[PDB]
Amino acid sequence: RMTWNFHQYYTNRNDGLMGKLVLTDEEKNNLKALRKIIRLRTRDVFEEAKGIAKAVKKSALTFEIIQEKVSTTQIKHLSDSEQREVAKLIYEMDDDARDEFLGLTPRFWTQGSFQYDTLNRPFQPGQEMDIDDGTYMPMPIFESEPKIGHSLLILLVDASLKSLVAENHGWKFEAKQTCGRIKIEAEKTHIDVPMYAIPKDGSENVNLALREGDRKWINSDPKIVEDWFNDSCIRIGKHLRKVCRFMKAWRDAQWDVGGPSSISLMAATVNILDSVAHDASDLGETMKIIAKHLPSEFARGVESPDSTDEKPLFPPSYKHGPREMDIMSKLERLPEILSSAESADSKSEALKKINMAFGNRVTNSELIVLAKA
Structure with a gap:
């Protein structure tokens, strides 16, 4: 009939x-530009922190001097307590942990719907595009926690995201259990940055970092x-x-x-x-x-x-x-x-x-x- x-x-x-x-091509390009801004800042934060460890490899600097060096980096956008903790973690590194940190360079790969190519324009007021760009840390395999450290890695990614939020009006930061989030209400957009540990050079050794709980890592x-x-x-x-x-x-x-x-x-x-x-x-x-x-x-x-x-x-x-x-x-x-x-x-x-x-x-x-x- x-x-x-x-x-x-x-x-x-x-x-x-x-x-x-x-999404229009302009909208897609905007999201890609946002991702690039976050990726660049994360690379730069790690280079800054690494420059300090390089200095400490050359000469066993005082905690006070390490602190003052931390304060000239983007890490200045963390709270006083958090800045102290980065300085402390760098100060406490042994030779082997410091070497691996000096060899660490964050890598990137986009996940979620931007990657599935099913990202829809948002409908209701308040609804935002859910965008995900993971940061990956190539490191030796570990049992419960790696060299370099779960704490230091999260602090540096937080430092990257928070330093961007401080520089851009209309950007806000949110801590989530599986990621740091940058929210940009005015662009109906938020970008999530989960952090992973992966081997240095097959999913059994890709570990997602968890922000709080009785587990710091989960295989995901x-x-x-x-x-x-x-x-x-x-x-x-x-x-x-x-x-x-x-x-x-x-x-x-x-x-x-x-x-x-x-x-x-x-x-x-x-x-x-x-x-x-x-x-x-x-x-x-x-x-x-x-x-x-x-x-x-x-x-x-x-x-x-x-x-x-x-x-x-x-x-x-x-x-x-x-x-x-x-x-x-x-x-x-x-x-x-x-x-x-x-x-x-x-x-x-x-x-x-x-x-x-x-x-x-x-x-x-x-x-x-x-x-x-």
């Missing part, structure tokens, strides 16, 4: 949902999820990134703050498209298929693609509190919204209904076309 088709509603890069979600390699997703796009096809964007857009529209993680949605969606027949020639039908199957994916718990990670991306239903129940409720409603939109009385009502899933972003009802199904 007659149905409304939404393939252009979703895919049109002029003014369909893809057109509303994909962002490349595992990155490779899994790139492999899934090749396996499933070009439409995978598109439907993941649409599910993330749904989430941004249903919750101002909160909702399921982007990775939980991506993992579930990959499982569905790997196992259920669908048709990239009609992404309206494909989204209906995904929507029909997401509730059962989420109710049983969404497993991480990284098998070494035993914490689910979303908990199974016997572990649900009010927030997970709220997510289940909105997941259950989504295929109903999409079905109702398909059988609406008019184009304008079709648009109104499907925009109750993705928000009022697409306004062009000409993208919706009368079809048979």
Whole structure:
């Protein structure tokens, strides 16, 4: 019978949902420039701290002199206590720890959606682009804590980020458990800088630094999820990134703050498209298929693609509190919204209904076309 088709509603890069979600080249370039600013400052902070250790290798300087040298570097932007601690850690280094520090140069690699290429323009006031650029410290393998030190490394990355925040109006710093964060409200953007220890020259030795707790390090390699997703796009096809964007857009529209993680949605969606027949020639039908199957994916718990990670991306239903129940409720409603939109009385009502899933972003009802199904 007659149905409304939404393939252009979703895919049109002029003014369909893809057109509303994909960053402009200027926006992408701005994020890349922000990342470069952070990377440069981090390299420079480490060179400064290393210059001091070089001085101490040459002559066993007093603590007071080491301190005064620390105070002329970007580390001056840390609190008095923290500056003292850097100075102390440099002062207390033995020959072997100091040598390895002198050979340490931070490396970089971007993770998250900027790297998955599924970063959406933010929807609701207050929502920001979640950007991640890890700092990697090549060091010998260690059992519980390396030479150089967990404390010194975090202090120097904090020094890099805090020195940028001091130099730029509209930038704020936040300490998170897994990263330092720079927030730039005015640009609807925050950039997260997790720090990793990695071997010197295969995921068993990539260690994420944790800011507080009974563990300073946890084995977590962002490349595992990155490779899994790139492999899934090749396996499933070009439409995978598109439907993941649409599910993330749904989430941004249903919750101002909160909702399921982007990775939980991506993992579930990959499982569905790997196992259920669908048709990239009609992404309206494909989204209906995904929507029909997401509730059962989420109710049983969404497993991480990284098998070494035993914490689910979303908990199974016997572990649900009010927030997970709220997510289940909105997941259950989504295929109903999409079905109702398909059988609406008019184009304008079709648009109104499907925009109750993705928000009022697409306004062009000409993208919706009368079809048979």
